[PDB]
Design an enzyme around this catalytic site. Structure first.
Site, PDB file in Angstrom:
ATOM      1  N   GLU A   1      -3.393  -9.090  -0.145  1.00  0.00           N
ATOM      2  CA  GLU A   1      -3.945  -8.808   1.157  1.00  0.00           C
ATOM      3  C   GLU A   1      -5.465  -8.683   1.167  1.00  0.00           C
ATOM      4  OE1 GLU A   1      -1.713  -5.664   3.110  1.00  0.00           O
ATOM      5  OE2 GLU A   1      -3.519  -5.510   4.394  1.00  0.00           O
TER       6      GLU A   1
ATOM      7  N   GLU B   1       0.981  -1.195  -0.032  1.00  0.00           N
ATOM      8  CA  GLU B   1       0.151  -0.088  -0.065  1.00  0.00           C
ATOM      9  C   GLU B   1       0.807   1.156   0.177  1.00  0.00           C
ATOM     10  OE1 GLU B   1      -2.642  -1.633   3.327  1.00  0.00           O
ATOM     11  OE2 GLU B   1      -4.167  -1.385   1.662  1.00  0.00           O
TER      12      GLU B   1
END
Ligand code: CA
Length: 1239
Positions: A523, A437
């Site tokens: 994820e 991220e």
């Protein structure tokens, strides 16, 4: 006269050539938590320091505090000092010596014998320092590590200190390099079964003053076996390596039909490299290897050794629950074991390099590791200003002698290359993940990111050609440009692309939009549940009781429930696998009660750990676990029921109907109910699965009956509505052929039953025998049962542990997020009927008796045997000496040393024996300096440090800074200053006349008097501490990064473009001649329909720390008008459900920013918001149109960061120190106790 330090336990630590090349260096360190001390010099009096064995986490022992942040578990970090003193036997003369740290969190600084070696910022990458050049051979040496974990530095619980094994490497001057051997088998896929070509490259360093003529003799043999079982050998031609040079020496071995490393059969080999000069072997270097290969197809996904495999993965943070960051091998091993039982075959090391121990474990246990090196890159996340973002792009100092990776560019390269160097030969590691991220929770342009990505990719490729690199990007789902460019470049360099938090629909969009990409769910899920909670079936938001339903209906706003994230994956062969967030709960990130800023969240005690785990911090599975097992483990049969079956815990609704859920890998399930005291089972219903199998051959089960759930994914499990009645809900299971599944063989609760009141403790230990190494652990589960042994659903009985024997209690846990009881206590409340106690061995063999006790409940007792490490001598040995080693004597006086010293032995016996001390020179007595004195007891050589003092002018004054609300920690001692300029390294204990803690609860300066008695003469010291408020700096808009931007107004009655308000432009298009305005939003439509207000809501995937809001309202001629002052209102929440008014001040600017646009600026103290709902109320005016409207071009949501600035200056003003520096009468010391400038 003379003064002496208090008696400390002195352990003699020795490094001789008898030891192995690389030796455990974990034992006998001294530690002190102190922001102020300066302990680098070997002379320093560490007598009063705590003795600890590494690995060690110094965050986990400090007390929780609301002044800290939720993300980091409300636990503090700060400055830790580790010191270890040891002799280097003179037999090591000629040899090279290095210290190796697997991890130190964080900002480590290393001195050896007073020389400063260098620093290492990153907290999870491994590193080394050379000690050769600075070692005192045949003498006492002192290594010192200063750890500065200055918060905030993590979005999760970091922990602090040397939390992973340290070692010493002793070698010849001609030696294999650090991690010097790299093995490649480029053709294994082709050669499998036959002879395999191994291509080795070995760095051989010639760290001598002579050219050297070297040959390598390499041998591949089964790990743990003898060399004579080798399956290949080679001996190289002579290579000449110049003095102080090194060379990469290529070799080839032909492996005779090596056994493949696989998940089912993780066969390891050792690859021994001997460095030869003439006849003699100079160095011998082993590395663990496995023969295995992977492949990624963009359509059919992952494959290991030719077989198609689904990556059934969990994300795992590093902490080990109640033990904190400590990377205890058994702790780590236990986690993997539990995961394997769930059906897991892969772990993503989110979001940082694993402990070598984990890699080791995975190698032997057969689990695929995706080793992630970084979370953020060059931009820090969540205003964690001290996080690795600070360092990622910084160059390494010339004077910094840290080792492990490439030092020629940025820390990023060093940390990346270091990790790869360590793990390059590990069969378990399948990919290098290069970030997570990267563009989430940050500020400013991201246009630089794709370039930074490529740089990392290039480095990785060059570091290890053998494994695909990857990352985990959460803006793929948002179709960000950056995200697309980055994936092409990944793909182009043989990478696999990890998308975070994609739904099935998005997985499909990616395939169509990017056919080149091979993709996985890097994820997924982020479902939030507590253990054993059943009284509701809803969640995904802050509850009243600080827990969340165990039913799989609760998840964060960005994520999805387990059923959903698995369903979306299992169906698609082209989605190579999932890495669920997370396998185990971790300390910190207590979403939905998360906090990126200082302060408690809800009522204290606030939840301090995660809800994401399939398994809680203690290693107790949540219910969802058996769902995963049902879906993933093909070596067992799952049949598991929830909820528990007591009046007070179930969720009744629709006339006493309770949703009963069954997780199972069976084809058919019949559900029975037996009323209490009855013996007749009544069939409630029967349900059959449909066994679909995809093209690639992955086979799953969905329920497709008439009573199937409307939302598809929930049909991956079975749900009945049973009416509440005391009794036993049981279930039986049948296979495809309708053969019953035997009653014994199921996993999970085949039946729930209505339980009695709390009656007994049942306590079992996972291993009844452990190793007596001071390392191994026994994990003791304690359940609270009724009289019949039925675990009581809601039991919360405080259990107290009595550990007697050759062990000691190192932790207690319940995996309850808001329970703040000390982990290092002898008691803890059970939670949902369970509590854990962790017991560690000693270094002497013996027996451990552990006793679980609780008020009014039958105790339980477990026995654990500790067996001694092979080759430890049964005959009694000298362990340690108890005596004072530091003596400060007045000049002209003889040092009075003690006649006797207490000696300890392996038996734990203590005999006081006499010491024959060496003679003290007459010269030395009046010399007024420091020296050491040797003595002899029970054969061993003891030493004492003596410092001679003529006269002391005064003791140096102290200065610090503290945040308002946090009392200053005053120094244990203060240094001595001679009448001569010189400042001594001798410190004298001070007693402070401490004001009330309340004094620190307002801003200002605070003086504290304290006195110390030095040679009978009391000295007066002043500590002048400055209490300060946070220094808040407002950042840039983050409106762009919104996960979602919704509208109150129904779809049909909306006017103009909403998304325009985060487009980063403030101006209005005049939009003459009608049509929806592309530049701005309005409520014209809803206004006309007579609606006075409207609500715009921004949602984020990470809590934003807001520090200002600017709204760019606009006006037209017909209708749209700037709103009235003080009428526009803002609100914030953590879940989308529970709101809170933002206490802000509105300022309507004097002039328009652009024609017919006026910025309204909202000011307020920093607050965390994952949602921001702006409620716009129309002006109270009339318009030509006769319709009044409100209009926005932009809403800038600006972030803010807080620092506590402490000054650096030794200069003077008015005497007084400029930066509140300590004034001593003039030698001065800056607020940061770093620079002392005497004038
Ligand atoms: Ca705009």
């Amino acid at each position: 006269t003379q003064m002496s330090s208090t008696p400390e336990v002195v352990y003699s630590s020795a490094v001789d050539s008898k030891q192995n090349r690389t030796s455990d260096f974990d034992a006998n360190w001294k530690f002190m938590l102190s922001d102020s001390v300066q302990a680098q010099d070997p002379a320093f009096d560490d007598s009063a320091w705590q003795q600890v064995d590494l690995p060690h986490d110094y965050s986990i022992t400090q007390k929780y505090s609301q002044s800290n942040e939720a993300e980091s578990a409300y636990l503090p970090g700060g400055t830790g000092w580790y010191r270890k003193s040891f002799t280097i036997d003179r037999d090591l003369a000629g040899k090279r010596i290095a210290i190796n740290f697997d991890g130190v969190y964080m900002n480590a600084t290393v001195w050896f014998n007073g020389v400063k070696l260098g620093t290492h910022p990153y907290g999870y990458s491994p590193f080394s320092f050379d000690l050769t050049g600075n070692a005192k051979f045949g003498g006492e040496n002192t290594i010192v590590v200063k750890v500065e974990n200055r918060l905030p530095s993590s979005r999760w619980y970091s922990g602090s200190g040397i939390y992973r094994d340290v070692t010493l490497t002793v070698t010849d001057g001609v030696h294999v390099g650090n991690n010097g051997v790299a093995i490649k088998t480029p053709s294994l896929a082709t050669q499998n079964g036959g002879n395999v070509t191994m291509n080795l490259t070995t760095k051989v360093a010639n760290d001598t003053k002579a050219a050297a003529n070297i040959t390598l003799k390499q041998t591949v043999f089964p790990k743990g076996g003898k060399t004579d079982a080798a399956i290949g050998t080679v001996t190289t031609a002579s290579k000449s390596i110049a003095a102080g040079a090194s060379a990469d020496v290529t070799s080839t071995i032909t492996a005779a039909s090596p056994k493949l490393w696989s998940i089912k059969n993780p066969n390891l080999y050792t690859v021994r490299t001997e460095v030869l000069n003439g006849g003699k072997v100079l160095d011998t270097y082993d590395t663990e290897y496995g023969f295995r290969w992977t492949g990624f197809d963009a359509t059919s996904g992952f494959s290991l050794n030719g077989e198609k495999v689904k990556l059934k993965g969990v994300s795992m943070h590093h902490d080990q629950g109640s033990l904190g960051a400590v990377a205890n091998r058994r702790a780590i091993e236990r986690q993997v074991e539990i995961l394997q039982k769930m059906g897991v075959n892969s772990i993503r090391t989110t979001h940082n390099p694993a402990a070598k121990a984990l890699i080791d474990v995975c190698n032997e246990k057969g689990v695929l590791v995706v080793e992630e090196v970084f979370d953020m890159w060059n931009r820090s996340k969540n205003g964690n200003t001290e996080d690795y973002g600070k360092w990622f792009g910084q160059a390494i100092a010339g004077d910094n002698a840290v080792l492990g990776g490439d030092k020629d560019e940025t820390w990023a390269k060093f940390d990346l290359t270091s990790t790869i160097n360590r793990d390059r030969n590990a069969p378990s590691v399948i990919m290098w993940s290069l970030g997570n991220e990267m563009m989430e929770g940050i500020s400013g342009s991201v246009s630089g990111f794709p370039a930074t990505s490529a740089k990392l990719v290039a480095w990785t490729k060059a570091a290890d050609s053998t494994r695909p690199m990857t990352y985990g990007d959460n803006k793929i789902k948002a179709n960000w440009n950056e995200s697309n460019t980055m994936g092409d470049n990944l793909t182009a360099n043989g990478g696999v692309v990890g998308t975070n938090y994609s739904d099935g629909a998005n997985y499909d969009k990616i395939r169509t939009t990017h056919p080149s990409w091979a993709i996985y769910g890097s994820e997924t899920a982020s479902a939030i549940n507590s253990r054993g909670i059943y009284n509701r079936t809803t969640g995904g938001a802050q509850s009243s009781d600080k827990q969340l339903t165990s039913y799989d209906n609760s998840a964060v706003g960005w994520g999805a429930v387990a059923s959903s994230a698995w369903y979306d994956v299992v169906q698609r062969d082209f989605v190579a696998g999932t890495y669920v967030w997370t396998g185990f709960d971790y300390l910190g990130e207590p979403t939905p009660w998360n906090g990126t800023g200082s302060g408690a969240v809800g009522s204290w005690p606030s939840p301090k750990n995660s809800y994401f785990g399939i398994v809680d911090t203690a290693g107790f599975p949540k219910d969802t676990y058996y769902f995963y097992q049902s879906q993933w483990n093909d070596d067992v049969h799952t049949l598991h029921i929830l909820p528990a079956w007591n009046e007070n815990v179930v969720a009744k609704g629709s006339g006493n109907n309770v949703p009963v859920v069954v997780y199972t890998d069976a084809a058919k399930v019949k559900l029975y109910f037996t009323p209490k005291g009855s013996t007749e089972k009544r069939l409630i219903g029967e349900k059959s699965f449909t066994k679909k199998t995809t093209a690639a051959g992955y086979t799953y089960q969905v329920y497709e009956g008439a009573d199937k759930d409307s939302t598809a994914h929930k049909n991956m499990y079975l749900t009945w509505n049973v009416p509440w009645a005391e009794g036993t809900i049981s279930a039986e299971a049948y296979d495809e052929n309708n053969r019953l599944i035997p009653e014994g063989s199921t996993e999970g609760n085949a039946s729930v039953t209505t339980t009695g009141k709390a009656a007994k403790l049942k306590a079992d230990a996972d291993r009844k025998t452990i190793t007596a190494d001071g390392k191994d652990l026994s994990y003791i589960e304690v359940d609270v049962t009724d009289a019949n042994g039925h675990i009581v659903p809601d039991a919360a009985n405080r259990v107290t542990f009595d550990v007697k024997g050759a062990g000691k209690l190192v932790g207690v846990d319940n995996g309850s997020s808001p329970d703040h009881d000390s982990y290092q206590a002898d008691n803890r409340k059970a939670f949902s009927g369970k509590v854990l106690a962790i017991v560690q061995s000693t270094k002497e063999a013996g027996e451990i008796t552990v006793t679980a006790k609780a008020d009014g409940l039958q105790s339980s007792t477990v026995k654990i045997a500790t067996t001694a490490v092979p080759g430890t001598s049964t005959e009694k040995t000298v362990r340690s000496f108890y005596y004072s080693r530091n003596y400060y004597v007045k000049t002209g006086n003889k040092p009075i040393l003690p006649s006797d010293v207490e000696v300890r032995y392996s038996d734990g016996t203590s005999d006081r024996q006499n010491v024959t001390w060496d003679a003290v020179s007459d010269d030395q007595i009046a010399k007024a300096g420091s020296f050491s004195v040797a003595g002899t007891v029970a054969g061993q050589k003891i030493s004492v440090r003596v410092t001679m003092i003529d006269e002391i002018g005064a003791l140096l004054n102290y200065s610090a800074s503290t945040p308002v609300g946090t009392p200053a920690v005053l120094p244990g001692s203060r240094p001595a200053v001679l009448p001569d300029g010189t400042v001594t390294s001798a410190n004298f204990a001070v007693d402070w006349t401490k004001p009330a803690d309340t004094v620190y609860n307002t801003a200002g300066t605070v003086k504290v008097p304290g006195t110390a008695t030095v040679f009978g003469k009391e000295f007066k010291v002043t500590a002048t501490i400055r209490v300060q408020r946070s220094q808040v700096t407002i950042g840039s808009s983050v409106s762009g990064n919104a996960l979602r931007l919704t509208q109150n107004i129904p779809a049909d009655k909306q006017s103009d473009t909403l998304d325009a308000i985060k487009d980063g432009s403030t101006t209005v298009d005049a939009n003459t001649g009608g049509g929806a305005n592309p530049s701005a939003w309005t409520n014209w439509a809803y206004s006309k329909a007579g609606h006075n207000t409207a609500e715009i809501t921004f949602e984020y995937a990470t809590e934003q720390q807001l520090g200002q809001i600017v709204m760019y309202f606009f006006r037209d001629s017909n209708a749209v008008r700037f709103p009235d002052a003080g009428k526009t209102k803002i609100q914030i929440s953590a879940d989308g459900k529970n709101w809170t008014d933002l206490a802000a001040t509105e300022t309507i600017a004097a002039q328009e920013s652009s024609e017919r646009v006026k910025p309204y600026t909202y000011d307020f103290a920093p607050v965390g918001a994952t949602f921001v709902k702006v409620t716009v109320t129309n002006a109270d005016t009339t318009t030509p149109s006769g319709v009044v409207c409100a209009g926005l071009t932009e809403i800038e949501l600006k972030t803010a960061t807080s620092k506590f600035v402490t000054n650096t200056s030794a200069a003077l003003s008015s005497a007084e120190g400029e930066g509140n520096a300590s004034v001593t009468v003039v030698i001065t010391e800056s607020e940061d106790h770093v620079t002392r400038k005497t004038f």
